[PDB]
Amino acid sequence: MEMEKEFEQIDKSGSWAAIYQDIRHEASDFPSRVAKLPKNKNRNRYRDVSPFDHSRIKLHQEDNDYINASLIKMEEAQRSYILTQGPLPNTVGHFWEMVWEQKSRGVVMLNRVMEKGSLKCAQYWPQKEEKEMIFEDTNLKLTLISEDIKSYYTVRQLELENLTTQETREILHFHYTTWPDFGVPESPASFLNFLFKVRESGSLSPEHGPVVVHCSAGIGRSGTFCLADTCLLLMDKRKDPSSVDIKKVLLEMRKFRMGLIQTADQLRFSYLAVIEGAKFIM
């Protein structure tokens, strides 16, 4: 079916639950043996969220190559994304080591450092120009250059220095700051606007490494981000835009990382955003 009237009519019969469950029932299952080694326990935020062996990002080091991060590779759409958990205090250095090695241009953050009174991820970037951060274990330096604070998101300009070779690179930090503590946004407007600002920077482009995206666990809000972009990019690519099947796209993406889209509310928002962005950017 066209994705607009599946929506009008899921709300109507209201089977959002039902639909979301079939997706869970049909999603891929692949091994995660590396994530589950004892030696990595402390490297995972959540015990039920792990990267598949086949698609995990490997750090370049003899030590331990492990990070909770997955490469999502969309073939027809010609877009790749790295989805990862928000970093822990002990893993911050691994995170930036990963950004350096994969040659990413942008980092996209869909959550606040603190939500609902608990820590959602480490404060992993510097907040004042004159106070730079240094990751000792991976031998990197990170400096804040500038920042643009707008009402629904912020953009930061950062400098990452490989202290071993003295090479420097410019990283963009795209920080969506207003997703609610509970539930999903009510309108997708601002989310839509954020998404187009990321495209505009060149961060999602092939002339760079994959974009790094994350929230808490790296599956819920992060999955909405990548599903939406890919669905909107496919729409413009096909002779008939209406042929795009979002459930099909989501199940493809779940071949590369478990659990993408965590609630039916999030599934709904995804359709809603795609339906709306279709008719605008068109």
Ligand X SMILES: O=C(O)CSc1ccc(Cl)cc1
By annotation, the residues acting in catalysis are 215
Residue 88 in the binding site for ligand X (CB under 6 A): yes
How far apart, in Å, are the Cα atoms of 191 and each of 42, 206, 235, 252?
33, 23, 18, 23
Q: How far apart are CA 115 and CA 208, in angstroms?
A: 32
Tokens of 9: 């009519």
Per-residue binding string, ligand X, 19-48, x by CB under 6 A, is -----------------------x------
Residue 137 in the binding site for ligand X (CB under 6 A): no
Contact in structure between 213 and 226 (CB atoms under 8 Å): yes
Is 218 labeled as ligand-binding?
yes
Whose tokens are 């959602």? That residue is: 120
CB of 196 to ligand X, least distance (A): 35
Stretch that binds ligand X, among 84-92, 219-227, 235-243, 272-280 (CB under 6 A): 84-92
Q: How far apart are CA 167 and CA 269, in angstroms?
A: 41
**Which of 42/164 has CB closer to ligand X?**
42
CB of 45 to ligand X, least distance (A): 8
Q: How far apart are CA 214 and CA 84, in angstroms?
A: 5
Stretch that binds ligand X, among 68-76, 86-94, 150-158, 221-229 (CB under 6 A): 86-94
CB of 270 to ligand X, least distance (A): 30
Residue 49 in the binding site for ligand X (CB under 6 A): no
Residue 89 in the binding site for ligand X (CB under 6 A): yes
Residue 90 in the binding site for ligand X (CB under 6 A): yes
Contact in structure between 84 and 122 (CB atoms under 8 Å): no
Tokens of 186: 């009510």
Contact in structure between 84 and 67 (CB atoms under 8 Å): yes
What is the total count of residues that contact ligand X (CB under 6 A)? Answer: 4
CB of 246 to ligand X, least distance (A): 35
Tokens of 181: 């503590």
Structural element, H or E, at residue 233:
helix 221-237
Residue 64 in the binding site for ligand X (CB under 6 A): no
Stretch that binds ligand X, among 88-96, 104-112, 158-166, 214-222 (CB under 6 A): 88-96
State the amino acid at position 207 in one-letter form.
E
- Detail the residues annotated as belonging to a binding site for substrate: 181, 215-221, 262
> Given the rule CB under 6 A, which residues bind ligand X?
42, 88-90
